[PDB]
Design a protein around this ligand. Sequence first.
Ligand code: FAD
Ligand code: FAD
Ligand code: WP6
Ligand code: WP6
Ligand code: CL
Ligand code: CL
Ligand code: CL
Lengths: 489, 488
Amino acid sequence: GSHMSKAFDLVVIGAGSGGLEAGWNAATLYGKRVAVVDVQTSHGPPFYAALGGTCVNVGCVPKKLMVTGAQYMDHLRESAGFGWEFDGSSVKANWKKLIAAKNEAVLDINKSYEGMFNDTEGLDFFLGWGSLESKNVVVVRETADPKSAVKERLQADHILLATGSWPQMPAIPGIEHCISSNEAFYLPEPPRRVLTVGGGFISVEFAGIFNAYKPPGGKVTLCYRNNLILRGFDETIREEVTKQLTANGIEIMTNENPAKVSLNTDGSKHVTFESGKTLDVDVVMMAIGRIPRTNDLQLGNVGVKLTPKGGVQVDEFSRTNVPNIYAIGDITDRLMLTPVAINEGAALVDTVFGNKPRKTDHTRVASAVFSIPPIGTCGLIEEVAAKEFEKVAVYMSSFTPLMHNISGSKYKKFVAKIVTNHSDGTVLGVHLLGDGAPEIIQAVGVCLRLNAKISDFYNTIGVHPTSAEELCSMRTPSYYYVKGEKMEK
Amino acid sequence: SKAFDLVVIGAGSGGLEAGWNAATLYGKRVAVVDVQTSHGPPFYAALGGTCVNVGCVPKKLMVTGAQYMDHLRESAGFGWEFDGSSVKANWKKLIAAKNEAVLDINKSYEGMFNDTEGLDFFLGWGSLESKNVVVVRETADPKSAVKERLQADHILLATGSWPQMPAIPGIEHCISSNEAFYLPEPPRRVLTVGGGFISVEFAGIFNAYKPPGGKVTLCYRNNLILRGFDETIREEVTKQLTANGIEIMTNENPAKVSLNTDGSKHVTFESGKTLDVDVVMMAIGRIPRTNDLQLGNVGVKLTPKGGVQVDEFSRTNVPNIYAIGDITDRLMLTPVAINEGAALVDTVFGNKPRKTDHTRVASAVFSIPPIGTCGLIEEVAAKEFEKVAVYMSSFTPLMHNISGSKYKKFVAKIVTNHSDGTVLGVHLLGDGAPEIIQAVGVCLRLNAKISDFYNTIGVHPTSAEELCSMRTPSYYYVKGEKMEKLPD
Ligand SMILES: Cc1cc2nc3c(=O)[nH]c(=O)nc-3n(C[C@H](O)[C@H](O)[C@H](O)COP(=O)(O)OP(=O)(O)OC[C@H]3O[C@@H](n4cnc5c(N)ncnc54)[C@H](O)[C@@H]3O)c2cc1C
Ligand SMILES: Cc1cc2nc3c(=O)[nH]c(=O)nc-3n(C[C@H](O)[C@H](O)[C@H](O)COP(=O)(O)OP(=O)(O)OC[C@H]3O[C@@H](n4cnc5c(N)ncnc54)[C@H](O)[C@@H]3O)c2cc1C
Ligand SMILES: CC1=Nc2ccc(Cl)cc2[C@H](c2ccccc2)N1Cc1ccccc1
Ligand SMILES: CC1=Nc2ccc(Cl)cc2[C@H](c2ccccc2)N1Cc1ccccc1
Ligand SMILES: [Cl-]
Ligand SMILES: [Cl-]
Ligand SMILES: [Cl-]
């Protein structure tokens, strides 16, 4: 006869930044029975993400290590200025060694998270592909093909969709000759010539990475379809980052977009842009965007509605149009950042299972770009602020620090900008570029949630000598926007 | 002509801020006096002050130089390969690059005087002749040729401080940090005497630039270095200096230093223990530089400590004579002195009176690895508040597991008044700590609570995000008593 399905208060689809924080909190804080589904228990091909999520397996965590590795190129050169001497012709960047180090580090996190499943009562992990068979039934199948064999049918009171996002690949001829960030983490050799396609943080970060590790006579090229990389970021910074990448030897192609790629005789790639221009490279890494990973969930089975862009539509509390079905993290197409997914999962579990309804605040969120040098930022850019306030003030400091006069890296301009509501002094945004920018910016996030005014920044006594003390020496606006237009008046 | 709205004795952090605000923001006629136009022997400090010439600015460059000892080694873990045995640390190169950068700052400060109307600079030694007279003499000797007398509406004392040298026999064979900046070769064996930030910072510099077989020793007369800093961090920095080869000799104080014929120094400690070194750098404290001012001539009051006494608005007992900066023997920090000077000018020549806030001042120690701190340490908090909670996070970041520097724990601590959640102090150890703390200083002006920190979304991956991931206290103090759990 028949026998019982395994049953849960909460089934989470995707063992990532957001779904792990939800699953953990529901099990350990509210004594719920939780199932969590993911397609792999450790990182890498075939599926790249795995137990742990995108950040842990193929984003924030391995990239940062790789960016840190890339920084030694600068450090070794800059040390001469302080008197370090050594045989410069003996220097070699060993990519294989970096990839192996990073692989070990990620696997340890993978194993560690599996151990925490094994050790936590009421928190179960399920290996495979999850989808919605009906409103309270989650099936887990062998592969993403909806006709592959069912492994388990889970009864679920509540279902959380947290499958994250996936790299956008444009439908152009030869797209199958390109890679994404996923494969970039697994290249067996460092590419000699690479094109990173796109202007966002992922394209920019990997360009620096590839730039540090490329072999003899290699060349890194980045293309973006518009005028100026890093759309969404402060404008001075977009321009500074452009020049500083260039200065470190990276070719920026603005106003270009690939129209197709063919394979050369020798296995390299021959890229033709929309403009008629061409470029031959060993690697084409597409990083033009990430799209909500919804295709495998079978949402039609239950009528979960999407937005026009393709994300799962949700209210401020992460609820879908179907009761007992929720969605958080990249699948919702808000801010695609790990600590927002984390914050979203926690808020959702407080709301549904705790006694503290709460909604995630998506404004004033701090974030970074680990370019070399990095960007740290929190809040509104000046052109956004000008459109929402009658009188905006901009304070700006920008100078090559002294250490970098001695180091020889003179192109390294530090930029600090504070954007105010000039009617009351409220700080709306802070924008930084230069060494340590991502660390400086964290407590600025706390500042904005405290409705800090410019006078709070300037009244604070500086720590000397730092870059950060620039945020506390600015008293006079560099310029303003008055009902939409720039001046010093 | 020889009459000025303001005379500043000491062209330093505090004095030059005051000298510049008065002339540029108020149109006052200003005179500033200093002993030397650029850095170095004989007088070390000069135009720019201590920070520019023999303090924050050159030491930060030199600690920056010292960090490459770690960087070169840590690079192997990330796949970098080069001939380790060809590595050499060239001190003369470092000192020459430091000297050039500092000289550029002297020169550009000289430029701004020459180009600025009613801001005048005078070479020599300033002393108070009468209430509205400042004499500039040739040397620090009262009895040497007068160079100028300047009539002064208002007088600012900003002569700063000077290394304290204890009266032990053989003190004359020891140096201070002043000479340390100009050593022609890096010492092979060096004893840094003091538990405070100059000693600790210099110990890390010498440790990196030391020749083969060299050894750095730091000594401190009490049990634990960095008195005044977070206890966890004091212990943790101690272990990480030891892991990088520096010897920490606590509970020891030099009683005698004698000179070997080969030029080395033979140090006898109070314990009767002895040690031989090439250089003994005394960094046991810094005292207010008041001896050459001739304060007797007008009776400006000094505290039982040596410092010019002042009220909150930098006023001495002699009307129209003010004191700011290390001469006041309070917080000896460049940006404080700068704040004091500007607040004083706002008060004397401006609209609104203004007083410097001495509480919640963020500061750093550029040790390797470095410290960033703002506000109260827990044991001081436990004396002023009935329930205090401590949130702590301490672990070796992942980059240092790959780097091979496993000993490098990052420490983050928040101290609250547990009754209302107000953040009383934050204390940090690890790469980035001086940069991370700056904006914490602002949070504390805004009376931030622990929940304001925890509710802010992290920037990931950073060390700083650790400040925004703490919601459960690690331990507490109740009525001064340390305990893990609250009692009820
Ligand atoms: C290259 C790169 C670098 C990044 N760097 C940063 C950074 O520095 N800082 C930062 O904050 N963010 C960074 N991010 C973003 C961050 O990774 C995401 O915002 C975050 O992981 C989203 O969390 P999530 O909970 O939405 O989903 P994820 O963490 O992506 O988890 C989704 C999981 O679901 C699994 N899954 C998918 N479909 C199914 C299915 N049908 N059944 C079962 N399991 C399924 C996937 O395997 C995956 O493990 C980066 C992203 C990338 C690609
Ligand atoms: C090694 C070292 C490292 C330091 N690092 C830091 C740091 O990292 N961060 C920080 O905030 N602080 C640091 N400091 C402290 C900082 O330098 C001082 O707090 C600051 O410079 C004090 O400023 P001041 O205005 O009181 O006078 P100073 O900057 O000390 O200026 C005093 C000036 O007066 C001159 N003078 C003295 N007597 C006379 C006279 N009678 N006539 C004419 N001129 C005279 C001297 O030439 C000197 O230029 C450091 C100090 C030292 C010694
Ligand atoms: C609290 C927590 N939240 C997570 C958020 C995002 C990720 Cl990718 C991982 C975790 C992690 C975790 C690990 C296994 C199962 C559930 C949660 N986890 C458990 C944990 C406890 C103590 C230290 C580190 C991790
Ligand atoms: C405003 C200002 N304050 C100082 C505080 C401390 C020091 Cl050590 C130096 C200055 C600096 C200055 C330089 C020459 C004369 C007076 C003041 N100065 C001038 C300046 C203007 C713009 C950029 C940098 C320095
Ligand atoms: Cl290689
Ligand atoms: Cl040398
Ligand atoms: Cl730092």
